[PDB]
Subunit: 284 residues, 6 copies
């Protein structure tokens, strides 16, 4: 597994800090003194999966010289309970307090996603079927969100419109055929791109499998349909189910001979995971 790198994230965290301070942090600067070391504790207030700890840390490190301490040796991925002491943060009060909210907003958002993902995986209860994310991401945080999904046991779809070809309802509409669209796609980007078709009917699934595409997406199809689609396609393409996949629904795929399912809810509708920073103490 791969953590996130400062090279990847620095510009985004900078922007977020600027979002949160346009002149200065009056509330904190009024009370504190420029000098003097302090310690604050990061506590998990809710159960789930840890994600974004590096990102959390990095918020502080761009701002100021700040040290950490990890007594329980927590890592992105670890399961969490409320009251767990995830991390200790050491530095000047001004740094600890000004940076707090941004850091937490990243941590809370990411951990939320990883937790929702891990819970989907569990509710599915079938290793042979993978859980994938989408491009239904929060604007300008896709990178961070894809990472969280991985941390929760999920997997990454195409990142971008540049990564791979996905012929959607609208693409097929504009050509007028499933097969003409695939042909055109193959003509345009001959060998280096995966080609996927999004499909609503069994008609369209047949056309696609026949034209020899790499991946077929079954959009919002009934279980009866999917069962038939599987047999139709008969291993000619990989199979993805998508649309309207949630914690309750997801178990319906258990045991099917599809390759993966994908969910937008993991990225566009994730509940965040509560943490807090309490127990400010001076070193002394």
């Amino acid at each position: 597994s791969t953590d996130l790198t400062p090279f990847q994230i620095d510009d985004t965290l900078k922007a977020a800090l600027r979002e949160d301070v346009h002149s200065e942090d009056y509330s904190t600067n009024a009370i504190f003194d420029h000098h003097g070391q302090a310690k604050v504790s990061l506590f998990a207030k809710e159960a789930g999966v840890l994600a974004g700890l590096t990102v959390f840390q990095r918020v502080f490190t761009l701002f100021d010289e700040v040290t950490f301490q990890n007594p329980h040796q927590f890592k992105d991925g670890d399961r969490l309970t409320s009251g767990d002491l995830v991390l200790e943060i050491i530095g000047s009060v001004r740094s600890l307090l000004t940076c707090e909210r941004v850091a937490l907003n990243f941590l809370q958002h990411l951990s939320g996603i990883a937790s929702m993902t891990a819970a989907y995986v569990e509710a599915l209860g079938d290793d042979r079927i993978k859980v994938f994310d989408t491009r239904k991401t929060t604007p300008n945080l896709r990178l961070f969100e894809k990472y969280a999904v991985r941390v929760g046991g999920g997997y990454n779809h195409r990142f971008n419109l540049s990564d791979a070809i996905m012929l959607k309802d609208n693409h097929i509409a504009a050509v007028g055929s499933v097969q003409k669209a695939i042909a055109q796609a193959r003509a345009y980007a001959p060998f280096v791109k995966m080609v996927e078709v999004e499909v609503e009917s069994l008609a369209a699934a047949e056309e696609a499998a026949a034209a020899g595409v790499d991946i077929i997406m079954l959009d919002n199809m009934s279980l009866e349909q999917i069962e038939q689609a599987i047999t139709l396609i008969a291993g000619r393409s990989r199979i993805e189910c998508s649309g309207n996949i949630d914690m309750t629904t997801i178990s319906r795929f258990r045991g099917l001979a599809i390759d993966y399912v994908s969910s937008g809810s993991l990225t566009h509708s994730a509940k965040s995971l509560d943490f807090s920073m309490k127990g400010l103490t001076y070193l002394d």
Copy 2:
């Protein structure tokens, strides 16, 4: 209320577009076509519309793109699934390449407005306002605050530079409520609102006496809040916060507080489903 301006949003939408297309949109560019086209924007789910200008603007930065609004939909309107919110007219390459970004904005924003409007309704008391927080999605605060407004909510301080909020940690570090307020007033004398976050009736007393502008009752029982109201006796504005959800929120109904605030509105909003379907060529 007041819409979002290109000046405010353009850099963010540009960035989101670049996020989504590093080289080119292979899928779409592959379509060898005859011409103007039209696609329809449909609401797939009930709630409140927010971010329609933003949605539109994604297309308008990319290319020359026209709209049509047959049902005269505006940010704020209630929506039902299948409503024809908008029609988008332009080249296929523009319509398709811009689609996902535009929708991701629209879905996220409408989601927030919907959740907000629902909190307002569950509260059922116009004399008490619903406020957002700083518990926002990183780099989208501006947008999120706007959505809250659209849903009938109100805006807290935008950030740490807007206004002074003396939290648990601040009061800890000084050792007094009143010394902290004095120090805050000394630092930013007349142009900044000062708010104090408070857990006990002790602390609420100190603060109201020291003449602060806003007192925040953190996670207090209803018995307590009732007494706090009386103690404070109109000396400061009153905010209740902490652990405010769709079910809880009605507990405030009778009260002579000024507002309540919720993070859940910004950090945990379910997005609102829309789609773009029905691609047709014009001729």
Copy 3:
């Protein structure tokens, strides 16, 4: 007091350096050798108040590895005489000479402001009345300029149109009333924003004080008027005097029961404070 942070200033100094070098510094690079340590001295050529020393230093530090020496222990705020040895700068010749002008232009501009501010404070001669800056700032240096004002013994008005509400002549014009404008302002940003009204007549001052606004600004009012305005308002709002406040005028407020006065001249019309960098020596 709070100094300025690299986080706050780095992007601006970078931009200024780029302004001053688009390819390279031909004049300096032609003569120097890439290698070899040197020392230059920063001298105050004019009396006043020091401001922007950190900023001065930081110009060099972004560019190159550069050390300083402060034999007289000078700090932003200290009073200065011509010939004072403010600082010694140690590093490669190329760094010392290429960075010089930018660094000085910051220092000179900031110290100029702090000096003009301190002189206003002195000419006023009344601690009970504070001296405030405005939004009449040099474009893209507001942050730096507000800081200098603080250093000279002044105080900071609202930074931005986002910081606080100020209902000006034009706002009141567009509504048609003083009180309707205040009402509208309170309706729009209910509790978290200070509300100020800018006022020319005693009529308007009465309306505002009655509607219970936080701050009233007396724009360019005669001393007779201000005296009456004070009594009218009768402590209902804070009182700010503004417009046409200069070194000579400013003493006219001495002893009045107003809260502060504010001046644009401090930021839009500050004379800069002369320094120079002389006595280049090689370490050897």
Copy 4:
């Protein structure tokens, strides 16, 4: 002369606008209004107009905004208090939110042009040009140089890459005037002007002999300059600099120097008062 172009100024005006509005303009947005409006730009003080295009452009980046110039004012014109320089037409939100930034540019630039024109007048000699310096406001050099031109001044080297200026420190480090010039010519052979800053008649002699393009007489007495002129005998162009102010400047009047230069024009310019008043609605 030649105006400033959007290409040149847009990024700076965008930044200044962002400086002034981080979230939104609460004050102005609070106005719930009927419609196009009109505001008038009045000169509050006498001097020279500079930066009118810049002023205008602040509004035009923000929003669709029209102007009207009934007295046909142009950068360069002389101004009196109460002159109606311009009329601005657009939505209230645009007129009010953009106002201060626009004025801060206009005031600063006009201030510089005015001070410049006044130096030119106090000099009273067309054969001697007034030049600006690198002692500029950080990140506004471009703008400041333009204002100087508008006021009848002329532009020195824009920066350390434009042209070679061998200062006291440079000559110190080589140990000779002539060796420094030789080294400069060796480094940038044909495409760069070479100037030498000079304190004695000794050094002026060396430089003129070595055939440099421009000699700068730093802070020299009038007796000296008179002799320097003779010594140099047209071999190089001649610049006087150091300690040149509105009172001093007339001392150069008769002289056969090419130009004088002043920092005060850019680092110490008093700004020129304008205001925007008389908001009216159109109908």
Copy 5:
């Protein structure tokens, strides 16, 4: 094919313009002129036109500038010296200040398209495609890929995020061809093409067996390639690469490979001469 969009290119052209003008264009601004003007864009050399939109766009970001295309030239057309490709209409300051940047784009891009088209011709086999690489000019990859398309070429993976290419070093570090492929598939399961770079027939065998999408034959003899084709037996797509030049390229003519690739097309392209002459004033 599909043109380049302002969305794609604007930031790069802005930067190039800023590269070329830090303060102002002294040369051009010095011209004190009467008015619209017209300049003609002439091809000085034979080859393939590419980047005409880009050329145009340089002017259109700067200023209001119109074009005229009397011979209806389009990216892709063959060119001869003296052809009147385009006419440019606008203010002199715009025409002259923008000229060099615009031409530098046009010349570079057309150069690449020309070299590409020439490789395609020397190959003389439609069943085998000519591909570009990642051996591109820094920060112009997008543009360079486009030019290749215009010249009749095709696009490899745009970068290290587009698709998986297991090179000599990768296979070295795992120690197996097949283990490396397995690991790649495990890491990015369904959405990424996997290619293997291969030097021996051993390695080609392993790869084809493990079912990879594309095999690259690095710098292999014609005898070898012939056998490799047979060995692989349609299981993977086949790419030949390494040491492919205008003279060599014809050696592939009969073969049942899918494509060949060349770096020289992007890292070593001779540019294609154009000029802008015949400045006239309109009246």
Copy 6:
């Protein structure tokens, strides 16, 4: 001589790295392990002149903590043969492999230019005549390209339209005279700018030399013409020959009393110089 500075180049290399990685380097990250030190060797596969070694190095250093080793002590400027071991690069595998192509693309491009330049200088075989570059540069790499030219023994023309005045065919067209254009140029930028005129005929050369311009450029003139132009001008201006100067042509200037020649081909049409990175080994 002056190397290139991080201050100068960092933004460009960052942009190039981002160009080459929008999400992550899947190929490398799949195989490697985050941990573990390795060494790769940089070999010259082709003879010529080294340029851009610092730039090469810097690509890696922005990305990650990476060390170098230079056993043969190679410097920008050194002559090279195929198989020479230019440099050794030491760091994590992920860094070595992800950064490789960008680094090489800079090195190859720059060394290519320096080699083509040095070869022009040699083919000219006349020290009294200098070889100059132009503004016919690769967009957004001018700075890097000018440097390479210097490294190959060449010299730098004006960087920018801001550096110096060059009155071209189109400028002279728009005024209608050679001399009116020069006069206008002198009026606009009086003393601080060199003035050059680009000239096709002997007529125009005479006008210019008479009006006392600093530099005259003979555009694409026959050797007979140039010979006459030299005598005409009679030392009144410096002389530049330009247009259609290539490796074969260039010797035609040998012994002429011109000051320099200039070539666009050096920057717009340089063949790149082959290097490669081979011999990946783990430290162990």
